[PDB]
Amino acid sequence: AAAIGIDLGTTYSCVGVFQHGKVEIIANDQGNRTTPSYVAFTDTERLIGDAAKNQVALNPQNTVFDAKRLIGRKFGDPVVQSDMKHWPFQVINDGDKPKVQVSYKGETKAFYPEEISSMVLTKMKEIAEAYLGYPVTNAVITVPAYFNDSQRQATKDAGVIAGLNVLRIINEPTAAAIAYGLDRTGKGERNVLIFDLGGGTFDVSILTIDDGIFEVKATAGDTHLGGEDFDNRLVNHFVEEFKRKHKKDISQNKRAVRRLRTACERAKRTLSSSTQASLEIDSLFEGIDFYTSITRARFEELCSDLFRSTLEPVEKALRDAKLDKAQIHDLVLVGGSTRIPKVQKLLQDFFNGRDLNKSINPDEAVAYGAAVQAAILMG
Amino acid sequence: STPFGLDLGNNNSVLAVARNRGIDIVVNEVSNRSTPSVVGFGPKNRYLGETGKNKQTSNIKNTVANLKRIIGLDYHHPDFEQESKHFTSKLVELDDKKTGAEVRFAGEKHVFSATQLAAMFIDKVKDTVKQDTKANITDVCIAVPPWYTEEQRYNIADAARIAGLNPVRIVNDVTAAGVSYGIFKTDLPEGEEKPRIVAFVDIGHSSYTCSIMAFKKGQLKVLGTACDKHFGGRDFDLAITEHFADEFKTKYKIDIRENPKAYNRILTAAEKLKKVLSANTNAPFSVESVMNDVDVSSQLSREELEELVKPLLERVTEPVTKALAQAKLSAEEVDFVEIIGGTTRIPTLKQSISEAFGKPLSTTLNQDEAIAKGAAFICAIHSPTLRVRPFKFEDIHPYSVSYSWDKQVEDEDHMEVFPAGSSFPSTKLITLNRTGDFSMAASYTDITQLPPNTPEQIANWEITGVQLPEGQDSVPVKLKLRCDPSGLHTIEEAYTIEDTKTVKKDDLTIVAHTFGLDAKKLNELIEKENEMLAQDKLVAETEDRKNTLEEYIYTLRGKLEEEYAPFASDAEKTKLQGMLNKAEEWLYDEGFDSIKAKYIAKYEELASLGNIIRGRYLAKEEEKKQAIR
Ligand SMILES: Nc1ncnc2c1ncn2[C@@H]1O[C@H](COP(=O)(O)OP(=O)(O)OP(=O)(O)O)[C@@H](O)[C@H]1O
Ligand SMILES: [K+]
Ligand SMILES: [Mg+2]
Ligand SMILES: [Mg+2]
Ligand SMILES: [Mg+2]
């Protein structure tokens, strides 16, 4: 029996296993290599993963996500109180422990954050078991570097509820580092910056590694940048084109903007792997076709401040660490937004052309390293 | 040279390579682990793979997909309509009665054959691999459906050649998955031990294959294979789209069948609803402005979906029952059932497969990657330089094949050579008594056992150089008849005997007539592909240089105002700002659509000044570090 590595993510989770000299990331039964950290409750059943996420819009009060933000925290924690304002589900107080409150099978039910997370971990465990063909009982689970003892222990409890022996709780940027073999470089300290941008959330970590021993130097959380704002820049730009070319303003038209926005989200994604993208909206406004294009350079420029702002937590982390940028030996990119060329360019230009550890899928590198570490702890 | 395996799917293709420890999946330019099997055309260049798919919805009449399905396809084939209903582009008859695509490309009407079109895609995907490996790619193993015809295999092999690759083997796809199962599992039966019997079921975008195999350590034999080439994901998408076509006529008073673009939007949305229904029991269907101003908002339950495909599902157990009968097995003799292919994720299919074998389903392979990985392993077997752990496999040869020869002095003029239900590859040795030069041919012994409208004759040869010795009656010719590792029927050797001892006399010359292209035609198509490649590359490079120039303008402008500010005189800065402004305005004018050299020159003018200032900036940077240390 192999041990598995689980990235328990705030929005998505990922499981891998080290087998025949390599890490295999395991696809779920829908074929997806990550699984939403979502749990839905309905009149008849409980849904976990993709099924939970598929029905969220139609059952928003009973679909729980972001339990990671609550796990191991107190109800009176200003973070908990702050976060609540953004969730469509109910969070209650049970002796200063937060519980998510839901309608399940025609009844009101409350769940500890670690109960929701155990259901996600049970799912990842079952994914691993279907792929391996036998029971899985041993796991490394990852947490953020800023997690305190209580948050670490609650995550371990979620593991144990899910039927796992938790070999170790390890830091996410430590996991990303193990993925790239930065702990194989022998004696002598190397300073590693892990840059983890993806899914709104943003974490920069500086680790020091010496003889395979890890120490956290700094953590910087600028953890809301990345979504609507870049889209808004493209919408406003193109609204201005239609204004220019047709002498008409499309701003005060709900359906027309949503249609233009949709095209802008698609174009933005295309611009990560191509240097230009076409937009083609039939009868956009008042029966007029809008066919145009945008270059990657133009888009970067429209969003120049939004991109430049990713360096703020880098500079903050360097200050807390009391390091100069020339003292960072190694760079590791994790999270989906690090695929954006400008993110790579800004970072690389900031650190004067230092190489980037980036060849492992940035959504998978954390589960990757947890799997390597789980195999090491077994043998 | 690194071995390269290609799972060429109707919807998407997977790329695997043999290196380091073993076998890796190659990722494309968008970071995807599969690439859409799409070839599109524009005013300036081709749109291949991910870009083909990106441009698809706005360029439907010049986008060809279903590349696999039109290889070897007679234009007047009785089942042509089952293929063409899935095409959005114009199909036309070629000079050889096969099917091609007619397409607006580079300002002209172009006709391309299915072989040509497949070559364009193989070429793109070959470039993905060498971008990833940084190495030479000269050899491929292509996986194809077991229902591929002898002709189709030759055609896809020639497509590889037009793309500059040596098609080392054309392998049955589910056989390649079986090879990856055999090289990955570590506890297979070993000696006099009973083989492990594993059934494989692949259902993809277009095809349903069941193939049952015997496994021992280091080996597999395929026992039975059956296919439904008209059973896949696309048939589900289409049933959903037709359901909504009817619903929207009543509900919205719109007729998407009269509006190809509207219909295509529903079709695209229908695949996504289908996938939601593998996870959820109910799903909303929402499409905005499917026509001018009309937003549609409906739903579909899993139960409703299942009823929609009821006629198709009537065939659901056939490939299982047929593959078992060929194998001469009852369902209970199967040890494990492995599912692969994206369409096996539909719960009703899973239930039916499980029930047909009376077994739970196993999912111990990566379902998307198994075929590609086995193809890369098989390509490595053929490598003269990459030693690989040995694995032996035999595939099923479902039809009887005979060879015939000029009667001359022989009593018989034909014989069965490769029986129905034997294995391939296989070699048979014959000696014939011969009066002179002679013709030969390979054919199907019983044509009633083949698909409708299959020509009886497979291949034919002329053997020349036959010279009788003094005793001038006849001379024995030894022949080497081969069903090769791709299942292709050849003659590889013919020679005359005895020039006390019976030696060889003359090696004979063989002229082969197969479904494979002549050297002349092949080279003409290789040339066409090189021209289109050079044209695509020139456009991508000039597009790149123009983006790089634009980026440098914004970048150098911003720095001149910040970290470079202390490092330039007034005259240097305003001069550079003037040319930055002029270069930017040029990009809207003459430079909107210019040539590569000019984007490069415009860049070198700016950079030549920019670097003088950057140099001073960097020098003071090192000086601050000199004051440190
Ligand atoms: N979760 C899912 N539920 C239902 N169908 C799915 C799911 N995921 C993928 N599919 C379908 O599987 C198909 C792609 O599968 P696959 O990659 O095996 O096909 P392919 O190899 O390109 O096709 P073929 O082998 O027929 O040439 C698509 O039609 C896709 O919609
Ligand atoms: K495929
Ligand atoms: Mg070291
Ligand atoms: Mg397939
Ligand atoms: Mg070899």
B390: cis peptide before it, omega within 30°? no
Q: How far apart are CA B429 and CA A364, in angstroms?
A: 55
What DSSP designation does B98 have?
Answer: B
Quick check: CB of B12 below 6 Å from ligand 1? yes
Q: Which of A35, A67, A68 is nearest to A52 (CA)?
A: A35
**Resolution of this entry, Å:** 2.3
Q: How far apart are CA B82 and CA B86, in angstroms?
A: 8
Would you call B292 and A282 a contact, using CB atoms and an 8 Å cutoff?
yes
Specify which residues B136 forms β-bridges with. none
Are residues A353 and A250 both part of a single domain?
A: no
B297 touches chain A (CB under 8 A): no
What DSSP designation does B380 have?
Answer: H
Would you call A304 and B558 a contact, using CB atoms and an 8 Å cutoff?
yes
Question: Percent helix, strand, coil in chain B (nearest 5)?
Answer: 40, 30, 30
Asked whether the beta carbons of B61 and B89 are under 8 A apart, the reply is: yes
Domain that holds residue A83: 65-119
Which residues of chain A from 109 to 168 reach within 8 Å of chain B, CB to CB?
Answer: 130-133
Are residues A127 and A9 both part of a single domain?
A: yes
DSSP A253-287: -HHHHHHHHHHHHHHHHHTTTSSEEEEEEEEEETT
> How crowded is the C-beta side of B500, counted as CA atoms within 13 Å?
0
Asked whether the beta carbons of B163 and B126 are under 8 A apart, the reply is: yes
Tokens of B184: 């990955």
Asked whether the beta carbons of A366 and A179 are under 8 A apart, the reply is: yes
Are residues A60 and A133 both part of a single domain?
A: yes
Q: Which of A127, A359, A34 is nearest to B24 (CA)?
A: A359
B298 touches chain A (CB under 8 A): no
Q: What is the CATH number of the domain that holds A158?
A: 3.30.420.40
Asked whether the beta carbons of A41 and A62 are under 8 A apart, the reply is: yes
Q: Which of A127, A83, A84, A92 is nearest to A112 (CA)?
A: A92
Are residues A199 and A239 both part of a single domain?
A: no
For B95, residues 6+ apart whose C-beta sits below 8 A from its C-beta are none
Q: What is the CATH number of the domain that holds A303?
A: 3.90.640.10
Integer Rg of chain A from CA:
22
Instruction: Give the strand pairing for B509-513 and B35-36.
Output: unpaired
Q: How far apart are CA B233 and CA B241, in angstroms?
A: 13
Are residues A25 and A160 both part of a single domain?
A: yes
Give me ligand 3 centre to Cα B19, in Å: 28
User: Which among A273, A282, A361 is the nearest to B30, CB-wise?
Assistant: A273
Q: How far is CA A378 from the centre of its chain?
A: 28
Are residues A299 and A263 both part of a single domain?
A: yes
Using what technique was this structure determined?
Answer: X-ray
Q: Which atom of ligand 1 has the smallest separation from the CA of B274? A: 4
> Which of A309, A324, A342 is the C-terminal boundary of a domain?
A309
Which residues of chain A from 314 to 373 reach within 8 Å of chain B, CB to CB?
Answer: 326, 339, 361
Q: Which of B595, B475, B606 is nearest to B543 (CA)?
A: B595
The structural domain count of chain A equals 4
Are residues A269 and A148 both part of a single domain?
A: no
Provide φ and ψ at A91, rounded to 5°. Answer: -120, 125
For B628, residues 6+ apart whose C-beta sits below 8 A from its C-beta are none
Which of chain A's residues have a Cβ under 8 Å away from the Cβ of B288?
255, 258-259, 262
Provide φ and ψ at A332, rounded to 5°. Answer: -125, 125
Quick check: CB of B9 below 6 Å from ligand 1? yes
> Which of A309, A343, A367 is the C-terminal boundary of a domain?
A309
Are residues A196 and A148 both part of a single domain?
A: no
> How crowded is the C-beta side of B484, counted as CA atoms within 13 Å?
15
CA distances to A289, B110, B430 from B294, rounded to whole Å, are: 16, 36, 72
Q: How far apart are CA B261 and CA B572, in angstroms?
A: 55
Q: What is the CATH number of the domain that holds A108?
A: 3.30.30.30
DSSP B8-33: E-SSEEEEEEEETTEEEEEP-TTS-S
Would you call B284 and A58 a contact, using CB atoms and an 8 Å cutoff?
yes
Q: Which of B487, B449, B206, B202 is nearest to B326 (CA)?
A: B449
Instruction: Please give the residue of chain A at the shortest CA–CA distance from B288.
Output: A259
CA distance B34 to chain A (A): 12
- Based on the residue annotation, tell me whether A7 is a catalytic residue of this protein: yes
Q: How far apart are CA B583 and CA A116, in angstroms?
A: 57
Q: Which of B23, B20, B48, B21 is nearest to B371 (CA)?
A: B23
Q: How far apart are CA B605 and CA B589, in angstroms?
A: 18
Tokens of B542: 């000039």
Residue A287 burial class via C-beta count within 10 angstroms: exposed 0-12, middle 13-18, buried 19 and up:
exposed
> Which of A80, A95, A119 is the C-terminal boundary of a domain?
A119
Provide φ and ψ at B503, rounded to 5°. Answer: -95, 175
Give me ligand 4 centre to Cα A236, in Å: 43
Q: How far apart are CA B424 and CA A154, in angstroms?
A: 59
Are residues A373 and A299 both part of a single domain?
A: no
Secondary structure in 3-state letters for B448-510? HHCCCCCCCEEEEEEEECCCCCCCCCCEEEEEEEEECCCCCEEEEEEEEECCCCCCEEEECEE
Write out the binding residues of A for ATP.
Answer: 9-12, 68, 199-201, 265-272, 336-339
Are residues A143 and A263 both part of a single domain?
A: no
Give me ligand 2 centre to Cα B353, in Å: 20
Place of tokens 């200063």: A96
Q: How far apart are CA A240 and CA B92, in angstroms?
A: 44
Are residues A38 and A8 both part of a single domain?
A: yes
* Domains parsed from chain B with CATH numbers: 1-37+114-185+363-386 (3.30.420.40), 38-113 (3.30.30.30), 186-231+316-362 (3.30.420.40), 232-315 (3.90.640.10), 387-516 (2.60.34.10), 517-629 (1.20.1270.10)
Q: Which atom of ligand 1 has the smallest separation from the CA of B233? A: 29
A184 touches chain B (CB under 8 A): no
Q: How far is CA A208 from the centre of its chain?
A: 23
Which residues of chain A from 272 to 301 reach within 8 Å of chain B, CB to CB?
Answer: 272-276, 278, 280, 282-283, 287, 295-298, 300-301
Tokens of B375: 């193809």
Helical pair A365-378 and A172-179, crossing angle rounded to 10 deg: 80
Are residues A20 and A59 both part of a single domain?
A: yes
Alpha-helix residue ranges (DSSP H) falling in B25-113: 50-56, 67-70, 80-84
Which of chain A's residues have a Cβ under 8 Å away from the Cβ of B50?
273
Ligand 1 binding pocket mutation candidate from B7, B10, B11, B236 (most atoms within 8 A of CB): B11
